[PDB]
Subunit: 290 residues, 6 copies
C-alpha cells in the first residue's frame, strides 16, 4: 500500500469528514457474527475498527451471537438435543451451556482483541447491573405457536446505566442473555437484541455484520442488489427471503421503525467493513430508512 | 425467631453501630468459596449479606474461586490432565475451560443471586477494561521451581477505575483471570487475587470465607483456637499448617503487611457469617493485624 | 446479652435487610418528645439511633418539642401567664423565652448527644436561612376562635435548601420557631411542624415518639390496641381521643394525606424504639396509611 | 441626602472599586459587639452592611459576644456569682445560661435582622457539625494562674465545612461556645474566637467592632491616635492599655501573626462603620499589619 | 472629594444595597457609543464601571457601535461611497472595512481599557463560535423598501454558549457583525443588536449610552423631559422624534416588549453614568417599562 | 477518486488508527501561513482539516501570521515605513494597523472558513481575557542590538484559561498580539508565538505550515532533504540556513527543547498537508525531536 501517491491518501481521509461529524458523540450499535468472527484477520480488523470509532469520540456498542459455538460445546458435552420444527429446545441445561459459551468464551475473545488497543472493552449480559431484561418468546412452527424453552426477546433496557458506560469511554461487548421478571435467565437472539438496544440507546446507526453483499430483491439475480430501501417497501418483501435472512431484516425493521435513523446490512467478509460503511460511499451494504 | 422479646431484638441491632460507623463508606473485599458457595441456603444468605452491606453504604468487592467446578468440566470434556507435584498444568486448553467456568458459570450464579435484591452485582475479570494484569507464577515442587502453565499472580490493578464502580453503587464480582503484559490470559489463585485487590483498593477489611472455625495453633487441639494474631507471629507459624491452609494464610499476610487494617478468616459454613464477623463480637473467625 | 447464641444474633440482623433497602437514601422525619427526651438512657439511645440511620445512608430529620421546659423557665423568671381556655397566651416576652429554651437549651442537648458519634447534628429554626415560615394560627375555645398570641403553623418550607443539608450527611435538629411574612417569629406546635416538614421533604416515614403503647380504639380496653389503620377510618375516630392524643393523630393525618407513605406512633418509653419500629416487625407502634 | 449633586454621588461609588476587587470572593470575619449591637439604628445598619458584602460576592462571617446580656439573665434567675479576681466562675449552671442567651437570644436577633434582606444568615456554635472545638483556658489573677470554670480558647476549626457554608451564599452568625475533646461545652471569649476563625478560614481582613475611635498610643492625648501599626511595635505596647482594650488587641495580634493580611479596630458607634472601613479611605479605625 | 464628611460617604454607599440585591447574579446589557467612547476620561470611567459590576457579581455584556470610525477609515482608504437616501451601501468591500474597524480597532480599545482592572474582557462577533446570526435587513427610503447591501438584524443568538462566558467571570465586548444562514457576514446596527442580545440572554436591564439628558416629549421644551414611560405610550410617540433618536427608542421597545424588565436611556456624557443609573435614584436617564 | 477499489480505501483509513490513538484528547498547535493561507483551495482544506481533528476529539490550536497583508494595508494607508536593517519599525501607528489586519481581517477569514463545519472557531489575542502577555523584543542588525518598536516575544500564557476553551470543543484562532506588563500591546512573530503556546499548553505536536518540501541540510542538493532530526544536531545547523528559514527552525528548537514531543515542518502547498502529516507515514515534512 506504499506505492499509492500521497495526494490520494489525503483525499480518502478528507472524504471521511462528513461522516465523522455526523457520528461524533453518537451511539452506533454493531451486531457482530458470521465470518467476521471466525477468521483471525477479519476479527482483528473488527477489533481495530471498534478502537478507531472510540479514538474518534464515537460510541460503539457491540452485540454478538455464537450459534455454531453453542452447538459444538453441546456436542462435546454429549447433551442430546430436542427439536421442534428446526429449533433446539433450550432446557435449563442448554441455557447454562449457552451462557457459558457466549459470555465465557466468545465474548472474551472479542474483549481481549479490542483491548489490545487500550482499556476499552467491557463484557456484560442482561444479568449484570440488571442492564436489561427478557420476556419468554414463543415460536410458530408449521403454523402453530410452540414453546422452545428459555428463549426470549429483550424486554426493557436500563438506558441510563448503559449510556454512562459508553460515556466513560468504554465499549460494551454484549452477550444476549437476560433475566425475566422472576430472575430466570433467557437466551435472546443476537440480531433481535441488537435492534432492541439500538432503539433503547437512541443509536445513530445499527450495523449488521452478515455473510452477504447485501439485500437482493429477487435472489439470485445479480441485477436485484440494492443500496437503500425504506421500511414500508422492505416489510412488504420480508415474507419472501431465505430463512437465514429474516432475522437480519426484522431487526432492521424493528430498529428503524423504532426511530433509529438508519440500519445497515453490510458484508462481514470484507476486511474493515465497519470502516467502509461508516466513512466511505463505496458501501457494499444496503441502508434501511423509513 | 418470633418468640424473642422485642427489647433484645433491639440491643443486638444497637450493638452494630460501632462497626457500622467504622465501615461506612469503606471497601471490604470478600473472598467467597467453600461450602458457602455450594449449599443453596448459605449462598443465598451470602448474596443477601452483600446486599446488606450495600444498603448500609459499605462497598463490598467479591472475589470467587471455583476449583472443583473446573475439575468437573474438564472431566466432562474428557480433557486429560498433566500433573507436576499435585498441580494441574494449565495448558491453553485448560485456561479456556477455567475462564469459561469461573466467569461464565460460577460468577453468573453469584451475580444473579445478589441481583435478586437490586441492580447491584457486576461480573468482571482482569480482561475487562484492563482492570488488572497478571504475571506468570511458578511453583516449587519437592524443592525445585517448576512451570505449570498459564497460572499467575495479580500484577497491577487499575485502582481508580475499580473504585469508580463501587462508587456507582455496584458490587464487582471478580473472576480471577487477567492478561499478562503480552495479552496472554492467566488464571490466578483466588485467595491471592483477593489479597491483592484488597491492598490495591485500600480496603478496610479482607474477609476470607473458609471451611473451618478458625486458625488453630497446634491442630487438632481444641485448646489451640485463636481469636486474633499479628503478622509477625503468624508468619512464624506458616511452615506448619495443613496444605489447604497455606493460601488463606499467605493472603492474610500479604494483605495486612500491605496495609489493610485487618484480614479475617471466618467460617463459611455458618449462615450469614459475613454479618456475624462484621457486626457482632461473637465472631468465630480469627483476625489478623500487624 | 452475651449468653445469646451467635446464630440468632445473625437472624435478627438479617431480618433488617428489607427495611434497610426500603429506607436507603430516604428521608425519615422523627418528632422527639416525651420521656425519650427526659430520661438519660432513652435519650442516649435515641441519639445513637440517629447515628445508626446516618451510618446506613438513611436521612433522619429531627423535630423536637419542649413544652414543660418552657413552663419551668417562665416560672423561674416569674413571668405571669395569661390563659384562654387552657392555652397560654404567647406574648412577645413568652416567645423570646420559648425560643431561648427550645433552640438554646433543648436542641443543644440533642445536638451534643448525637455529636458524640460524629460531626452529624446541626440545629436550625425557620429563621436560619429562611428554611421555613409560619402563619399565625388561631385556636377555638369552648366553640369560639380565639387569639393566643405568637403561635402559628408551618407555612412554607425551603424544600431544596433543606434537602441539601441532609445530603451533606448532616442531621437537622429542628426547633419549631419561624418568621411570618413580616419577619415576626412565631412558635409552632412540634407535632404539627413535624408533619409539615415530612410532607415538604417527601419523607418516606414520619416517626412520632409518644408516651403510650399505641393508638387505642376505645381506651382503656386492652382489646382496643391496633397495629395499622388508614386515614379515612382514623379521621372518623379523631373526635373521641383524649386531649393529649389529638396533636399526634392530626399530624399523622396531615402527613399521610399529604403523601407520606406511612406515619407511625411508637412508644418513646422503649429504649431504641426507633430501631424496633424501622428494622423489626415486633413494633408496638401503630402505622397509618391512606 | 437628596441635596448632594449627582456627580459626587458617583465619585464616592467609583472610589470603592479597588476595595471591591481586593475583597471579591474573600472571607471577612467581623466581631460584632458594643453599641453597634444595642442601638436599633446601628444594629440595623450592621445587618444591612452584611447583606451588602454578600450581594457583592464577599464572604462575611459574624462572631458575636454578649457579656452584659448574660449578666442580666443570671441576675433575673437569681444565680449567685462566684468571682476570682474580677472574672465570674463559669459553673455548669452558668454555661447553660450563657449558651442559652448567646445562641438562643443574641444570635437570633442578628440572624433575623440580616434575614430581612434575604435567606442569608445561619446561626452556629462549635457544637453544630463539630465546626470547632475548645480547650479549657486558665486565667492569671494577681500573678497566679487560676481556674474560672468552663471557659476556653478555640482549639481547632473545621475549616473545610465552614468554607462550604460561605460558598452556599450563607452568612454564619457564630455564638462562641464549643465542645472540648470530651464533649464538654465551653464558653469562648468572642474577641479571641474571632481571631481564631479568621486565621483558620484564611480571611482577608478581621474587623473588630469596638466602642472607641481607634487605638491611642498614650491615652488620653488626642495627638496619640493612630491609623496603622505593625504587630512588632503593637505587642510592645500591649502591657500599657486599659483593661477593656487587651482582648481587642491580642486578637489583632494573634490574627495578623497568624497570617491574616490586616486586622482593624473600627468605631462600632458610627453607623455603617463596616462600609466606611472597607470601601473608603476615611477610616476612623486603626489597621494592624506585621 | 476629601472634604466630604465620612458619615455621608457612608449613606450614599448604603443606598446602593437595594439595587445591588436586585442586580446580583443578573445580566445587564450595555450599548456603548457616543462621547462616552471618544473622550478618554469618560471611556476610562466606563471601563472601570464594567469592572465594578463584575466585582459585584453582576454580569455586564457590552455591545459597541463605531459609525464615525468606519467613515474615517473608508475615507483614508479612498473607498467611494454609494448612497441611497442617506444610508451608505455596504458593499463586500465596505463590510470588510467595517468588520476590520469595529472588531480590530474599536473593540480592542475597550477590551484593553477594561482589562486594566483584571482578566475580564473578551471580544466577539456573531462569527465566533456561531454566537449569533444575522438576517439581511432592508430599509425604506422616501416610502420604498430598498437594499443597501450587507446590513442585517440579529437573527438568532446562541443563548447557552453566551451565558457560559458570563458565568466564567468574563465580560463579552460585542462587535455587531454576524453570518447569515449562508455564512455571509453582515453588519448589524449596534442599538438593534443590543436589544436583541438583551432579550435573548434574559437581561435584567438594558442600558443605552446616548448623547442626551433623556427622552423629551416635545423637544426642545425643557418641561418635556421624562423619568419613566411605558411601551404603549412610547410607541405612540416614536413617529415624532429626531432621526438620531429612533434607533435608541426602537431598541428600548423591542427589548421591553421582549420581556426585559426595564430599558434605560442615560447620559453617556456624564462620567460614571452607568454607576449613577444603576445604584442611585438621581438618574438623569429615562426608564422604559411595559 | 471513485475508480479506487473499496478495499484500499479501507486500508488507508485503518492505517490512521495508531496516530488517532496517539493524538486522541491531545493539544496540537498549528502555525498557519504561506500559500496554505492565500489560495482558496488550500485554505478551505486547512479549515476542513481543523474540523476533522475536532470531530476526532483532538484539540487543535491555530496561530496565524499575516506579514504581507500588513504591508499592503500600510501602503494603502500611505503610512511611511522606517527601516533598520531590513525590519520595519513598529510605531504605535503601525501596531494599530497590524492589530487591525491580523485580528480584524486575516483571523476573521479563518474563523468563518472553519465555522462552515460547525460552531468551532473562536478568535483571540493576548489582550482577550489576558490570555498571554508580551515582553519587548530587540533585534540585532549587522552586529548591534537595536530597537524596532512595539515588537515582542510571548512572555507568559494563561495556560489554564486557554485549556478550558479547547475543552469546550472550541478551536482558538490566535492573532499574535499581546499586552506587555504595562498594558502596551505588542506584535509578536507568529512562528515564535506558536512555539510558546505549544510549550505552555503541553501540546503533543507543533505543526509548521511553510512553503517548502522540508529542511534541506545543504540546500539546494536534492540529496540533502531529511525526514527527522534532533535538536542538538539541528541547532548546530541553524547559522547556515536562508533568512526565511531561521524563524521556522528556532521555533521548532524552542518547542522541542521546551518539552513538546515533536515539532514538524510540513509543506503548506500540499492540499490537506495537516492530514498527511498526522495520519500517514508518507509525510513530506521533517520531524524534530531532542
Ligand atoms: C455499570 O455497568 C457496568 C457493567 C459492567 C462493567 N464492567 C466494568 C465496568 C466499569 C469499568 N471499567 C462496568 C459497568
Ligand atoms: C444551609 O442551611 C444550613 C443551616 C444551618 C447550618 N448549620 C451548619 C450548616 C452546614 C454545615 N456543616 C448549616 C446549613
Ligand atoms: C465560547 O465562546 C467564547 C468566545 C470567545 C472567547 N474568548 C475567550 C474565551 C474564553 C476565555 N477566557 C471565549 C469564549
Amino acid at each position: 500500500i506504499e506505492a499509492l501517491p500521497t495526494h490520494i491518501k489525503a483525499q480518502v481521509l478528507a472524504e471521511a469528514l462528513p461522516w465523522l461529524k455526523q457520528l461524533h458523540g453518537k451511539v452506533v450499535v454493531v451486531k457482530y457474527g458470521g465470518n467476521a468472527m471466525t477468521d483471525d484477520t477479519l476479527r482483528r480488523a473488527f477489533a481495530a475498527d471498534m478502537a478507531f470509532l472510540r479514538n474518534c469520540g464515537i460510541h460503539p456498542v457491540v452485540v454478538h451471537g455464537g450459534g455454531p459455538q453453542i452447538t459444538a460445546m453441546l456436542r462435546r458435552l454429549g447433551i442430546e438435543g430436542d427439536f421442534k420444527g428446526g429449533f433446539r429446545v433450550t432446557t435449563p441445561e442448554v441455557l447454562d451451556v449457552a451462557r457459558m459459551v457466549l459470555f465465557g468464551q466468545v465474548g472474551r475473545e472479542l474483549v481481549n482483541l479490542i483491548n489490545a488497543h487500550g482499556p476499552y472493552a467491557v463484557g456484560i449480559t442482561g444479568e449484570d447491573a440488571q442492564l436489561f431484561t427478557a420476556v419468554r418468546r414463543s415460536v410458530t412452527v408449521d403454523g402453530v405457536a410452540t414453546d422452545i424453552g428459555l428463549v426470549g426477546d429483550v424486554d426493557q433496557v436500563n438506558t441510563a446505566a448503559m449510556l454512562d458506560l459508553v460515556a466513560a469511554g468504554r465499549i460494551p461487548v454484549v452477550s444476549t442473555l437476560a433475566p425475566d421478571a422472576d430472575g430466570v435467565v433467557h437466551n435472546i437472539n443476537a440480531d433481535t437484541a441488537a435492534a432492541a438496544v439500538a432503539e433503547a440507546l437512541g443509536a445513530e446507526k445499527l450495523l449488521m455484520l452478515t455473510d452477504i453483499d447485501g439485500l437482493y430483491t429477487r435472489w439470485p439475480d445479480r441485477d436485484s442488489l440494492v443500496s437503500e430501501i425504506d421500511t414500508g417497501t422492505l416489510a412488504q418483501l420480508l415474507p419472501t427471503l431465505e430463512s437465514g435472512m429474516v432475522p437480519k431484516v426484522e431487526a432492521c425493521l424493528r430498529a428503524v421503525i423504532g426511530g433509529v435513523p438508519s440500519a445497515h446490512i453490510i458484508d462481514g467478509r470484507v476486511t474493515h467493513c465497519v470502516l467502509v460503511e461508516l466513512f466511505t460511499d463505496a458501501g457494499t451494504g444496503t441502508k434501511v430508512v423509513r
